Design an enzyme around this catalytic site. Sequence first.
Site, PDB file in Angstrom:
ATOM      1  N   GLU A  78      21.019  24.378  30.081  1.00 31.31           N
ATOM      2  CA  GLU A  78      20.313  23.966  28.876  1.00 31.31           C
ATOM      3  C   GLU A  78      20.770  24.827  27.707  1.00 31.31           C
ATOM      4  O   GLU A  78      20.677  26.056  27.762  1.00 31.31           O
ATOM      5  CB  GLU A  78      18.801  24.076  29.059  1.00 31.31           C
ATOM      6  N   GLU A  98       6.997  15.503  21.112  1.00 26.62           N
ATOM      7  CA  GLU A  98       8.250  15.433  21.847  1.00 26.62           C
ATOM      8  C   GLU A  98       8.196  14.288  22.845  1.00 26.62           C
ATOM      9  O   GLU A  98       7.183  14.091  23.520  1.00 26.62           O
ATOM     10  CB  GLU A  98       8.542  16.748  22.579  1.00 26.62           C
ATOM     11  N   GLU A 142      12.540  16.883  19.162  1.00 26.86           N
ATOM     12  CA  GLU A 142      11.179  17.035  18.674  1.00 26.86           C
ATOM     13  C   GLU A 142      11.121  16.629  17.210  1.00 26.86           C
ATOM     14  O   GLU A 142      12.103  16.759  16.475  1.00 26.86           O
ATOM     15  CB  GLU A 142      10.686  18.476  18.837  1.00 26.86           C
ATOM     16  N   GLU A 152      16.198  16.825  24.356  1.00 24.80           N
ATOM     17  CA  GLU A 152      14.766  17.020  24.126  1.00 24.80           C
ATOM     18  C   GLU A 152      14.499  17.092  22.627  1.00 24.80           C
ATOM     19  O   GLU A 152      14.219  18.166  22.085  1.00 24.80           O
ATOM     20  CB  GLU A 152      14.266  18.286  24.821  1.00 24.80           C
ATOM     21  N   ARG A 169      20.070  25.553  23.734  1.00 22.51           N
ATOM     22  CA  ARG A 169      18.902  25.398  22.882  1.00 22.51           C
ATOM     23  C   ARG A 169      19.189  25.583  21.398  1.00 22.51           C
ATOM     24  O   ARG A 169      18.260  25.495  20.591  1.00 22.51           O
ATOM     25  CB  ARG A 169      17.809  26.374  23.329  1.00 22.51           C
ATOM     26  N   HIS A 200      17.229  20.744  22.306  1.00 18.78           N
ATOM     27  CA  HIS A 200      17.779  21.302  23.537  1.00 18.78           C
ATOM     28  C   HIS A 200      18.518  20.242  24.339  1.00 18.78           C
ATOM     29  O   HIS A 200      17.991  19.154  24.582  1.00 18.78           O
ATOM     30  CB  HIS A 200      16.657  21.904  24.386  1.00 18.78           C
ATOM     31  N   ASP A 250      35.137  -0.639   5.072  1.00 19.21           N
ATOM     32  CA  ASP A 250      35.762   0.454   4.335  1.00 19.21           C
ATOM     33  C   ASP A 250      36.307   1.520   5.277  1.00 19.21           C
ATOM     34  O   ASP A 250      37.478   1.904   5.187  1.00 19.21           O
ATOM     35  CB  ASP A 250      34.762   1.064   3.355  1.00 19.21           C
ATOM     36  N   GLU A 257       3.635  19.029  20.874  1.00 15.10           N
ATOM     37  CA  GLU A 257       4.448  20.229  20.801  1.00 15.10           C
ATOM     38  C   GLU A 257       3.612  21.408  20.306  1.00 15.10           C
ATOM     39  O   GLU A 257       2.415  21.288  20.046  1.00 15.10           O
ATOM     40  CB  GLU A 257       5.661  19.983  19.907  1.00 15.10           C
ATOM     41  N   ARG A 264      12.152  34.849  26.297  1.00 15.60           N
ATOM     42  CA  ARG A 264      11.473  34.331  25.115  1.00 15.60           C
ATOM     43  C   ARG A 264      12.263  33.195  24.483  1.00 15.60           C
ATOM     44  O   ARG A 264      11.723  32.107  24.255  1.00 15.60           O
ATOM     45  CB  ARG A 264      11.254  35.459  24.100  1.00 15.60           C
TER      46      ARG A 264
HETATM   47  N1  LIG Z   1      32.845   1.634  -3.037  1.00 14.66           N
HETATM   48  C1  LIG Z   1      33.390   0.680  -3.775  1.00 14.66           C
HETATM   49  O1  LIG Z   1      34.545   0.295  -3.610  1.00 14.66           O
HETATM   50  C2  LIG Z   1      32.504   0.084  -4.840  1.00 14.66           C
HETATM   51  C3  LIG Z   1      33.266  -0.241  -6.117  1.00 14.66           C
HETATM   52  C4  LIG Z   1      32.443  -0.034  -7.390  1.00 14.66           C
HETATM   53  N2  LIG Z   1      31.049  -0.509  -7.189  1.00 14.66           N
HETATM   54  C5  LIG Z   1      33.062  -0.785  -8.576  1.00 14.66           C
HETATM   55  O2  LIG Z   1      32.318  -1.211  -9.459  1.00 14.66           O
HETATM   56  O3  LIG Z   1      34.293  -0.924  -8.586  1.00 14.66           O
HETATM   57  N1  LIG Z   2      10.044  24.335  23.959  1.00 13.51           N
HETATM   58  C1  LIG Z   2       9.120  24.770  23.117  1.00 13.51           C
HETATM   59  O1  LIG Z   2       8.125  25.385  23.492  1.00 13.51           O
HETATM   60  C2  LIG Z   2       9.353  24.465  21.658  1.00 13.51           C
HETATM   61  C3  LIG Z   2      10.725  24.915  21.183  1.00 13.51           C
HETATM   62  C4  LIG Z   2      10.806  25.127  19.670  1.00 13.51           C
HETATM   63  N2  LIG Z   2      10.181  23.982  18.959  1.00 13.51           N
HETATM   64  C5  LIG Z   2      12.259  25.272  19.202  1.00 13.51           C
HETATM   65  O2  LIG Z   2      12.549  24.915  18.061  1.00 13.51           O
HETATM   66  O3  LIG Z   2      13.075  25.747  20.004  1.00 13.51           O
HETATM   67 MG   LIG Z   3      13.761  22.808  26.624  1.00 13.46          MG
HETATM   68 MG   LIG Z   4      10.000  21.264  23.445  1.00 14.58          MG
END
Ligand SMILES: NC(=O)CC[C@H](N)C(=O)O
Ligand SMILES: NC(=O)CC[C@H](N)C(=O)O
Ligand SMILES: [Mg+2]
Ligand SMILES: [Mg+2]
Lengths: 10, 10, 10, 10, 10, 441, 441, 441
Positions: free
Chosen positions: F330, F193, F131, F129, F332, F242, F51, F186, F313
């Site tokens: 990096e 991670e 998580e 990185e 983040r 990150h 498709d 983590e 921080r």
């Molecule tokens: N994404 C599609 O083309 C599916 C067609 C659809 N299921 C129908 O009955 O014609």
């Molecule tokens: N590197 C860490 O100490 C974790 C990062 C934290 N999980 C974030 O979303 O950025």
């Molecule tokens: Mg990092």
């Molecule tokens: Mg991390």
Amino acid sequence: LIQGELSRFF
Amino acid sequence: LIQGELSRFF
Amino acid sequence: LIQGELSRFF
Amino acid sequence: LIQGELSRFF
Amino acid sequence: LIQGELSRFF
Amino acid sequence: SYTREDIIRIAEEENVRFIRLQFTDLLGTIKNVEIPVSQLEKALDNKMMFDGSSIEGYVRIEESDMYLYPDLDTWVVFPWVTSDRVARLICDIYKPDGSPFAGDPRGILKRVLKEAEELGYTSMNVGPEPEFFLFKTDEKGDPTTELNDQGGYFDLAPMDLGENCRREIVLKLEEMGFEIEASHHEVAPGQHEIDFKYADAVKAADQIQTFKLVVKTIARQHGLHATFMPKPLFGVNGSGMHCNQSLFKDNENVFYDETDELGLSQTARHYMAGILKHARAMAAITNPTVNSYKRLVPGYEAPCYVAWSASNRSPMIRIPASRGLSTRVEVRNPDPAANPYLALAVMLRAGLDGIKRQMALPAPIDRNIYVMSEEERIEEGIPSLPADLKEALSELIRSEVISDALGDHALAYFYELKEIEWDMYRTQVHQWERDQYLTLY
Amino acid sequence: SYTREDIIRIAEEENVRFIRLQFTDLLGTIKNVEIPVSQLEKALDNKMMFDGSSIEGYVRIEESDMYLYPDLDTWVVFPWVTSDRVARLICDIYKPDGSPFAGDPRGILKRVLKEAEELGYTSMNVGPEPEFFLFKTDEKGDPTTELNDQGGYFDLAPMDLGENCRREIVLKLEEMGFEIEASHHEVAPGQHEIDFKYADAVKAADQIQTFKLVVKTIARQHGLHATFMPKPLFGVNGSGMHCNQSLFKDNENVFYDETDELGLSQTARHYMAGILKHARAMAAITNPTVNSYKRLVPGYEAPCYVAWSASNRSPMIRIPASRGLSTRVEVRNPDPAANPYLALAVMLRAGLDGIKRQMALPAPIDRNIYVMSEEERIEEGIPSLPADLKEALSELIRSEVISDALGDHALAYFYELKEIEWDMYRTQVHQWERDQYLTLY
Amino acid sequence: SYTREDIIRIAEEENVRFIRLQFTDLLGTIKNVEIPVSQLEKALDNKMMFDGSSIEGYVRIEESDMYLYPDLDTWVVFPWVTSDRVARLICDIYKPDGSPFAGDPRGILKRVLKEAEELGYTSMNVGPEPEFFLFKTDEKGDPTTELNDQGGYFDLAPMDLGENCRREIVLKLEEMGFEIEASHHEVAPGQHEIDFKYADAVKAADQIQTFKLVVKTIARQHGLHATFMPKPLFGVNGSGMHCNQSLFKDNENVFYDETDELGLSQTARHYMAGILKHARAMAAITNPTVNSYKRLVPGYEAPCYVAWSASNRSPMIRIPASRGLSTRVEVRNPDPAANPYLALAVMLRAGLDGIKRQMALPAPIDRNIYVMSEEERIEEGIPSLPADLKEALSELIRSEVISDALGDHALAYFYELKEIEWDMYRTQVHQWERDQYLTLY
Ligand SMILES: NC(=O)CC[C@H](N)C(=O)O
Ligand SMILES: NC(=O)CC[C@H](N)C(=O)O
Ligand SMILES: [Mg+2]
Ligand SMILES: [Mg+2]
Ligand SMILES: NC(=O)CC[C@H](N)C(=O)O
Ligand SMILES: [Mg+2]
Ligand SMILES: [Mg+2]
Ligand SMILES: [Mg+2]
Ligand SMILES: [Mg+2]
């Protein structure tokens, strides 16, 4: 600044 | 159109 | 325009 | 008349 | 045509 | 590497019965066309039609016809197939006339890499990185709200908690051909991670896709649920992706400069400046979901302001202490929900735009925590990332640099998808509202 | 191919104990006469008599006598028989005098192919695209309303959702002798599609019947229910059986014309014009059930208007981008509930009638979505497909071209069957009526 | 009758605390504006404003302002109010400029009666025969599928089955001011009929509305469910609302003619011819719902063909044997779901149009039951009623006589409502389809 690390007390 | 396409939100 | 009005069919 | 065959709807 | 009338047997 | 004859040889030898012709849509979902091994030669001759409008997602309007051009270097055989071996090939999307499809994310990344090569940069070395979180499932096999463990940063619980579904994932990836650097627990409970060794941009994105698929499969095998949701839970750390980047010109790191005070060349500084100016426009691609902006909140190490530092921080751009051939920039912002091809493409294009215009790097942010007021922030010229998907979409539309990176066809469909998603999200009445109100009012 | 001696040789070698003499009735249901292997020679001598009135379905009025003429090329041994091997042969129905039965759908298709050959077209190459749904069963083994998975278009599910059962079907079909092109997940959840390579019309219809039987059996083996119902659920996509057709004259595609702007010969244009002219008359055959017209509603890619295009939402006729020997005309009205023999026969007859009278092709529809008013639609001369079975039956009766394709005997019985079905349906009081009314009135 | 001072006197005497200003929308539903007794004088001064767009139903596009003009003769006090007495007044809808609203069904009937008076006919005497079903409720108070009894035509079961909620309803209606003729058990189990004495058309429609409301309330009191659904169950008789009509000119029945063989004047014959000519156009109003056409099926005495007789299975028009001042024309198409005002208006307009153009009465249908073929039926010129709501709507649109009776404003909104209803109904997948299919296909 720190919230997700202090989760051990929560 | 896209009626059956938006079924992921429904 | 009429969406909340057509709730009787839904 | 041909009623013994129409049991699929019944 | 008596259909709803013959409901006593059905 | 591999060749047609090699692929046929392993397919006959390994008793491969089914082949997945994998590609990616604009939302980063992995799509595939299943193929019996008797069609392998036809597939390798670039003659399979599908498709192609499936790239647009749920906003596709008309069915097209496009060819799958498999990449022979991406061949691999899944280890869990056991009885009937299943292999995969990652394919590029081509129009019937022979030109590549403009809406294919892999083609977009390839085009950006080509225009980078036009400036003399041989390759873009990328190390991500990603998580993820592990959740316990119920009897029906659906994820619950309970984490698989309660460990912390770099914790060690050998029994079933610290490693859990991390040792076997690494083992399977190693068998699959991955180069794994290290794995650790983590910050948030249930968060893990796994780091890969650095590779070229296209290979890095392919590895990210394969890694997500493998992690999900292996977690499902152990009766767990693996998610790459940016912020699955409130009050705990989110998941980031990150990206460490370095531009190379014939095995030479152009970001390195021994004479510089920070060991950073002018090219690297221009790259960082370009990324910084276009950050708000890139946010809609690197942070594509509604949930992505629940992660970009202060207090959880996620960046919230457009600035760079060597130690802070949560800076938008961080510079690792490594130098020489491993000097890196990096970024983040991205979360694992982002499309790797599109994210790498927009970041590289922003960096190249910074390089081209000899853009000036703003001053780094010191240990000055952002407890400063908004007046202090815009007095110092520190921009902030968009607060929600709507702002990011508006910035995306207004941008002329990274919209060119996306291209005309993909931009419209991505904008339609994200506008529909935001419109569905904004009209919902959440349980939080019914908790605050419905009694007070 | 096969011969009598070959069939006897495999039957003795394979330890075949039971043989199914398969045929089809006017409703497309697969009927068979079970045979012990000791009667194989008698069957191969075209000497087996059966009722033959079973073709008419539940409207049969008198018992007849008819001979089964097995087709040796259709021989195959089912793989799931295991202990006692069971084979099958597809047979034609012959009157005792020696002439073929006029009410046999396979004979109808053969006769239409013969009158096509009378115009110089040696073969009609057909590739169908049947789609089906998978439903979970209950303890008693009955289909529930819950889909087996929740995937999307071309979605990847290596666990046991999209593939698993699909893989097993493809494997079984490969053993049977089915040349499988490719398999993939369809738009609606629990919906799958498996495509075969193109074959001649009779072989294509036989393969469709065998494919439906095999899919149903394999799905039942895994505790699932497979249905080819056109619209099993409201609000989701239906199942279609898009038929790709191309006329051949001595391994030359007469639809191809390199000099044409679209690569379409005048023969192909006349064919498409003929199909478009008689579409409303063919609707009762290509869409035979009441549920077939719940699929023909806007917003789910099913065609609703008689028009052709190379790229549109849902044209009646679509022309794929492939050219050369693979130039094709795709008709998208049929659903898998249609009789393959009758559908192919009526489509071929309509195309040949268009060729004979040299009908002028109407202009293709552009990206102009049919949001236009009915006044705009009939101003542009765009006809619409019948809204229900009754309209299609009336058009079928009024038509003199495709009623000749059906023939005098089959037309009357098909009309009786469909009239009885519609009359039974129209007098029912559905739960929707009891939900809307019974409180408001 | 009543006057303002009288209404105030009873309101003070009866300790009426709440007043319902009742009106009707285009779908026949009873709507009201609740009023405290302190606003009775304001209501009686025709000064109360309300939306008025609520007449259009769920297709209303903009809020309007309209005045309620109560009809003092419709005053009544409900008997079940007990503690706090509640009264009602039936009101006409007036535009703020002073002219009556063109979309009010009561105003439509009044206008048709006025143009009838313009021809010298002072009144139109109407006696309806509404039938209803009684269903047992569940613990939650919802109607089940079980009838309250299993009686037959004119059956007698004194204990709890025969009368049950028929004696009490008649008693309450008599206390309310109704003139009840007789009550009896109908065809199907749980089906009952209560007949009122004849009254003028507006009074007849008001009595029909009040009767439906009272029957529903009383049935709910006894833990039963009363429905006026035309065909609540398949295979049993439906509910009709046969309307007996006679035109009067100064207390003289203009339908009577002693010299005529059938005792029918030329005026009555012209009236019946006019009703027969426009029957298919009126079907959308007298049979407004989708379920209405499940009743119009042969074998249950509902009319299915446009014809008149003095003795037949189910003629469209029946002429009772009564003569003199009680000579009547009975039209049997309407079901109790129809709007009484609109139905009476369209029937009267069709009759007057027949009178004006002096249409020739077709020959009555004898004991020739309609087992005759369709060729015999259209050879004799016997039209058939529409098979479903769509045909009736198309005939309504094409008609210029009864569309004028409806008027320009009401016709568009009625057409929109019915088109939306039919479109919602036609796309549903019913349980009957899942029973026939989903296994055979
Ligand atoms: N994404 C599609 O083309 C599916 C067609 C659809 N299921 C129908 O009955 O014609
Ligand atoms: N590197 C860490 O100490 C974790 C990062 C934290 N999980 C974030 O979303 O950025
Ligand atoms: Mg990092
Ligand atoms: Mg991390
Ligand atoms: N036989 C009768 O009088 C009952 C009439 C029938 N219930 C109808 O709906 O027309
Ligand atoms: Mg398909
Ligand atoms: Mg197709
Ligand atoms: Mg009656
Ligand atoms: Mg009557």
